[PDB]
């Protein structure tokens, strides 16, 4: 996903990602590894994938 929306990946969150794309439960046991990949997942002209 983009930058500022990484906060949305957690229980009780809401927004674009946590409402239309990918929702988590409260009774969730597990965890969330998030790390920047601009050097790979971004190219000049912007990735339209």
């Amino acid at each position: 996903i983009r930058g500022d929306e990484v906060r949305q990946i957690a229980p009780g969150q809401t927004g674009k990602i946590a409402d239309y794309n990918y929702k988590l439960p409260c009774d969730f046991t597990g965890c969330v590894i998030a790390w920047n990949s601009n050097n790979l997942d971004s190219k000049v002209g912007g990735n339209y994938n």
């Binding site: 906060r7 009780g12 927004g15 409402d19």
Partner: protein
């Protein structure tokens, strides 16, 4: 900081994810998910940079 009174509104959906991508959206006393379901008494918008 500028305080704006808000009244006589159909206050629209939770994050206001129209064009502006909001970095931090952390809510005290109200869960963000329920933010649509309620009717607020005395809303005040405190804006600054």
């Amino acid at each position: 900081w500028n305080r704006k009174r808000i009244s006589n509104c159909v206050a629209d959906y939770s994050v206001l994810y129209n064009s502006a991508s909001f970095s931090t959206f952390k809510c005290y006393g109200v869960s963000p998910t329920k933010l649509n379901d309620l009717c607020f008494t005395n809303v005040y918008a405190d804006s600054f940079v």
